[PDB]
Structures are given as C-alpha cells and as structure tokens.
C-alpha cells in the first residue's frame, strides 16, 4: 500500500539520520581552531575585456590557461586571449537565449546550450578558416542548464526536467540517462578522475552519480532552498554548494555529512557561482549584491572582497595553474583579477 | 611599437572583429521585442495567425518596423528561474478569453496569473497589452446566460456593454504600480484585422514615453 510504503520510507529516513548523527564525532572547526589565518588578501584588476553588448551568462577557462570563452544574451560566443585582450573568434548562435558554455579539454571543440532544449557543438580547428556547427544534440524536454566535456566524444548534460544525460557526440544518442531528482537540475560538477560527478537541483538536495554504471551513490540534504552552483574540491573527496539563502556549504562523500557552513549576518542575497583555488584554501563566491567574496576553506571568516562590477555577478572561474581569476557580470564586462 | 610581425596582424584581426560586433549590435538594438504570455489556449494561437523546441519565435514587419514575438508557453518548468532573461523587453502581451467566465473557474486562475506576472520584481516598469478575445461568442453567451455565476457581487444588468466594462475594470485594477506602468486594453475577435495597428500605436507610445524619461524631461 502507499501508506505502508511511505511509513517505511520515513522509517528508513529516520534510520539514515540516526546513523549520520552517530558517525559524527567532532566538528572540523574544532580541529582547525588554532591554525594560522591567511590574512587579508588584496587582488587587483589586470585586464578588462570589452566587447559584449548584453548580459554575460557563462565563461570557461581553457586548459592552456591563456584562452577563454564567454557567452552573452546578444547571441554571441567570444573567445579571448587573456594575456593580450585580442578577440580570436566570434561565433553567432542560432538562438540568443543561451545560459551555458564549455571549452573542450583538447581545445578543438566548444559547446553551448540554453532555452531551446538543444546542445550545440562547434568545431574550432578546421580548414576553411572558420567555425562550423559540428553537431546538434536534442532529446531533452526542459531548458538546458549545464554541460561539461568528458573527452572529444562524450559530454554530460543536465536539463530543467529533472534529468541528466551522458551522450555520444559521434552519433547523437542518449548513451546514459540519470534520473532521481524531484526538482529541475541547476548545475553539475565533473570530478578530475572523470569517474563520478555531482549534481545540484532545486529540491535542496545534491546527488553523486557514477558515469559508467549509471546509478546514484549518495544523496546530501543540507540546504532549505534552491542550489545554484557546485564544484569539486581539488583532492576529489569534497565539494561545495551555494544556495539562494545566502549560505555556502562544504560537504564530503567519505563521511557523507556536513563539514562547513559559510554565512554572515550582512549578506541576504543568494550565490550565483562557486569555485575553488589550487590546494583548496580559498573559496570564491559571486553574490547578487554587485560583489564577490573570498572565504577561507578551513575558517568561516572572510578574507577578501572583489568589487568593481555594476550589476549581479553571474559567472566566475579560476585558471588551471591558479594564476588569475576571471569574473563576469550582468554588465557586459569581463574582469581578470590577480 | 615593440610588436612582432604576427602581433600586428592579430591586432588588426581583433579590430575587424570589434567593428563587426559593433555593426551587428547597432542593428540589433533597433528592433522591437514583445513577450507573448497568453494564459492557456485562450486564443493565443490565433492572434499570431492573423498577425503574420521550448521557445517559439515569430518575426514580422509593419511600417518599416521589425517586431520579434517570443512565445514561451511550451516550457512547463519553474517559471521563476528563467523569467529574469526577459528584462528589457518592450511589452508583455496578455491574452484572455471572455467566454470562459462560467467554466476552479478559469477566469479566477487567469486573474491569479495576471496578478503574479504584473507585480513581479523584474516587470516594475514594463507595459502590458491586454487582449480580450472570443467576444462574438461572449455576447450571445451573455444574452443566453447571466454573469452572476462567476461574479457573486455584481449589481449591474445583463447586457454586453456593462458586463464587458465590468470585466475590464476588474482586470485593470490588479496592478500595484499605477504610475510607473500602464495597461492597454482591446476587444478583438477572429474577424478583426486592425490588431496590428493597435499593437503599433501602443508600442510607439511606450517607446516615446521611455525616450522622454531617458532625456531627463520627465
């Protein structure tokens, strides 16, 4: 019966919560109470990349750590050289409503997606000296929220219908489908090992997925609102989530429980982007109050403030070698900080 | 200049790209954008019929002006997470069927939708063009059935000219921004042809008022 099944589900949830409480002994703040703080950190704007004429919704650093890609609502996808602010490529999209972008690890391909429920893949290094639409992938029934390359022939895509997918670029087919979320999925993060990946949705719950077997491993429920961003700790044994209730949360998949909460009494707006740095000592968070913040990964105390944007900060990224931080905002300016 | 041979060519290529981007944006910022947000299937598919995937897009021209209409009724997802993408749209077109009063009630749900979309924090200064359609059915339905089924506190008569005005003023007072935004109302049906003229006049008024506010005169 439905009543018996919901009763036993509640009993299982109670047992899981009791085991979670039992397997917790000491807060990480207790261990790291007496650790030398990082001190105040001052970062300055080295470059400013003009050229967009609308809001900026995504950006991704290349593996060479010199080239980057940005996507705007003016139907434009632009590739920049960060050392000297020259425009390498400018690609016009079929639909303006784009809210995600990715840059291939090899460097030959780019991907984009948005409110058209289609993921478009463009080939960069081709003859004829232009860019062409390599492949269009369709099959989702909701707007596409994130995409992340696995290799030259596999990508992972999360949609607004509550389902993620692993594709095959050579022939467009849903190789694997991941289901289990109640609300629409907002973001996904891909592990460096490329064996597992994490997903965050609007049901205030995050999940871990195995790419090969296609079955969910764990589930984390700590927030009480929508989750807007997620990323992996460089080690691969932790991750961080940002939500609309103006708090960040650092979790782990070994102990399967909460580790840290980052909040303040003077912050009310939500978080739109989260990223780590090399060695995992700094959290970078973009907020809706025109401002960006830097947090210590072991202390909840703030360390630095990045101001200079005249609107909400939407996208934030850190290079592969950890030498610069790029931010975008709803005013058409990308800023590089060092 | 301390630049190598290739660096100057790269700079020239970047300059050409900048010129092309500016030229494209200048043309893009000269067109009119309208967000079509008709509730349900209340004649929304008809107005596009005589005025001529998740998001459907329609283009048309009138008096050397380009209109782009976005229909987003096929999403069926969380409306509060992709609605901020439509800031800066010139106008919001709303559609309501007048024959659904006795059919909870459809009209009350339409009222909830209008209230929710009119008082949103992203649309505090965006004009709404409201269409009341299926009038030809409505007049005979009124002369056959009373309006008190949907409206309990209605002391007026059972004629078309009074019921239509009562419904219009019942819809038009749901806005809490009586000064920043304005509501334009029209009565149309299948046989009417002058809808495009009404849309053009309303959008020209909106553009003129925005220009006057921008230059500091207001």
């Amino acid at each position, epitope marked *: 019966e439905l009543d018996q099944l919901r009763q036993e589900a509640e009993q299982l949830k109670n047992q899981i919560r009791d085991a979670r409480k039992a397997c917790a002994d000491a807060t990480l703040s207790q261990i790291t109470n007496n650790i030398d703080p990082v001190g105040r950190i001052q970062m300055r704007t080295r470059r400013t990349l003009r050229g967009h004429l609308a809001k900026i919704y995504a950006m991704h650093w290349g593996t060479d750590s010199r*080239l980057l890609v940005s996507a705007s609502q003016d139907g434009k996808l632009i590739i920049w050289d960060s050392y000297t602010t020259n425009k390498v490529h400018a690609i016009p999209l079929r639909s303006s409503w784009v809210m995600t972008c990715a840059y291939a690890p090899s460097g030959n391909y780019v991907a984009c997606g948005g409110l058209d429920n289609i993921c478009s893949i463009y080939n960069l*290094k081709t003859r*004829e*000296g232009n860019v062409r639409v390599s492949r269009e992938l369709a099959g989702h029934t909701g707007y596409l929220s994130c995409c992340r390359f696995l290799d030259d022939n596999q990508i992972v895509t999360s949609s607004g219908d509550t389902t993620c997918a692993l594709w095959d670029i050579e022939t467009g087919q849903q190789t694997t489908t991941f289901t289990g979320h109640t609300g629409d999925v907002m973001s996904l993060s891909l592990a460096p090992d490329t064996r597992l990946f994490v997903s965050g949705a609007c049901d205030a719950s995050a999940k871990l997925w195995d790419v090969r077997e296609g079955m969910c491993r764990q589930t984390f429920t700590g927030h009480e609102s929508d989750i807007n961003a997620i990323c992996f700790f460089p080690n691969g044994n932790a991750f961080a989530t940002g939500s609309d209730d103006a708090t960040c949360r650092l979790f782990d998949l070994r102990a399967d429980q909460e580790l840290m909460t980052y909040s303040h009494d003077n912050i009310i707006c939500g978080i739109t982007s989260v990223s780590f740095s090399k060695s995992g000592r700094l959290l970078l968070a973009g907020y809706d109050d025109f401002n960006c913040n830097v947090w210590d990964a072991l202390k909840a105390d703030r360390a630095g403030v990045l101001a200079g944007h005249d609107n909400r900060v939407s996208c934030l990224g850190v290079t592969d070698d950890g030498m610069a931080v790029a931010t975008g905002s709803w005013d058409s300016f990308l800023k590089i900080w060092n | 200049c301390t630049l*190598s041979a*290739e660096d100057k*060519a790269a700079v*020239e290529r970047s300059k050409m790209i900048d010129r092309n981007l500016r030229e494209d944006g200048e043309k893009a910022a000269r067109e009119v954008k309208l967000l079509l947000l008709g509730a349900g299937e209340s004649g929304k598919s008809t107005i596009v019929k005589q005025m001529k995937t998740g998001i459907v897009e329609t283009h048309f021209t009138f008096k050397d002006l380009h209109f782009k209409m976005f229909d987003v009724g096929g999403q069926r997802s969380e409306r509060k997470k992709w609605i901020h993408c439509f800031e800066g749209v010139t106008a919001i077109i709303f559609c309501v069927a007048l024959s659904d009063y006795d059919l909870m009630n459809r009209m009350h749900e339409s009222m909830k939708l209008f209230d929710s979309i009119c008082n949103n924090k992203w649309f505090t200064d965006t004009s709404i063009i409201l269409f009341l359609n299926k009038k030809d059915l409505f007049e005979e339905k009124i002369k056959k059935s009373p309006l008190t089924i949907c409206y309990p506190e209605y002391a007026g008569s059972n004629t078309y000219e009074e019921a239509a005005a009562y419904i219009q003023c019942q819809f038009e007072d749901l806005n809490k921004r009586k000064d920043t935004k304005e509501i334009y109302t029209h009565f149309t049906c299948a046989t009417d042809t002058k809808n495009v003229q009404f849309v053009f006049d309303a959008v020209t008024d909106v553009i003129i008022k925005n220009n006057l506010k921008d230059c500091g005169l207001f």
Partner: single-chain antibody
Amino acid sequence: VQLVESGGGLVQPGGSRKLSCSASGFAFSSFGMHWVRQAPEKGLEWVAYISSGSGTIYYADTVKGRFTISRDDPKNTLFLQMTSLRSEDTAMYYCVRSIYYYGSSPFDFWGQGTTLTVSSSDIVMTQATSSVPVTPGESVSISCRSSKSLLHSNGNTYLYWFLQRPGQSPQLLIYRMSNLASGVPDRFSGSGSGTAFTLTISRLEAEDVGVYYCMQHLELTFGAGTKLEL
C-alpha cells in the same frame, strides 16, 4: 580548397599585364595573401603581401614602387599589376595564403604558379651543410642559423622550415618552433634554446624529402636552396 593562377607568359621588359589568383574552397575574406617568386637559377623570393580587409600592403625593398597588388573579396580573387619589369624577372610565381591569430599556422597552402619569360638592414640566414645524405624512416633533426637571434620578447622560438618537392609546388613542413597545430602530421616537434633551433621528425618519410628553405618572419627572405639527396 584550391588556388588557380592565370596570366604570365612571354613579356617584353617594362610591359603591363594582369596576374590573377582565384581561390575556391575556403573563406577568402579572412586570409592574408602573399606573392612569392622562384627564379630558375635561384631559390624562393618574396614579392608582396596584403592583409584581410585591405588593411596594410607591403612590398620588397628591391621592388618597392614597381608592382602593386589588389584584392577583390566579393569577386573572390587576387590581382597583381605586372608592370615595369626588368630583364631578371623571368621566374615562377606562387600565390600563398596565411592567417594570423594565436596558435595559427600561416603559409600552409600554396598554389601551382605561373611561368614568366622576359626578353633580354635585412636578416640573412645561412646553412652549415649544403648537401646531406638522407635515409627516410629514421629520425631527422633540422636546424638553420641566421644573422640575428629570432626570439622575440614574448619568448617564442620563431622560424619556418619548409620543403619543395621536385616536379610540383612546395608545401609546408613546420611553422615557428615549440608549437604544433592541426593540418600537419603529428611526427613533427619543435624546440628552441635561445640561438639553438631544432625540428625533430621521428618518422622521416619521402614526403619530407626534397629541397628545403629555412625562412624568417620577424621583420621575408628565403634561405639557400639546399636539396638533401637520398
């Protein structure tokens, strides 16, 4: 992709003629264009350059004010005004494309060329050995030397190693050192050590056999024509 040459032939000194380079199979409006000359008794020699959009035009210091070059993007063609010709202009003419951005590989594609029979502070490079035996199938290391150091302040070793096959048009072997792009086989590797240059091909092939031409692009003079026999 193909480039077809039209014009040329028997010309009296100081004549006037049209030279045309027709392109088909690629985006012509985004590529800069070069004209290259090869004398029957000599090697290659640069003539003229124009960029995309007719931005800048460059001529050789020995032909400055003698020729001129134009580009027609809507008609998709390249034109040269063959005028004021001396007695030493009889040669073979080649049309070359080149695109410059970060990571690009210019000088990739060459035309067939046209024959011309006429009636009757620069950097100079050198080659240590003017004739070397070659066995394909092994690893080959190649290097050229010049009158200046080719390294720029940006820190890239910067020199082009190029091949001419006997009987047909030349083709590209490697562009500036330490960088390998698409369009060429993966066997190539480049390296630089200030004044030490190195091109390494692990699997030498008959494709990489012929006459080379170490070339500079800093400030375009070709190296001495050295045919490495088999």
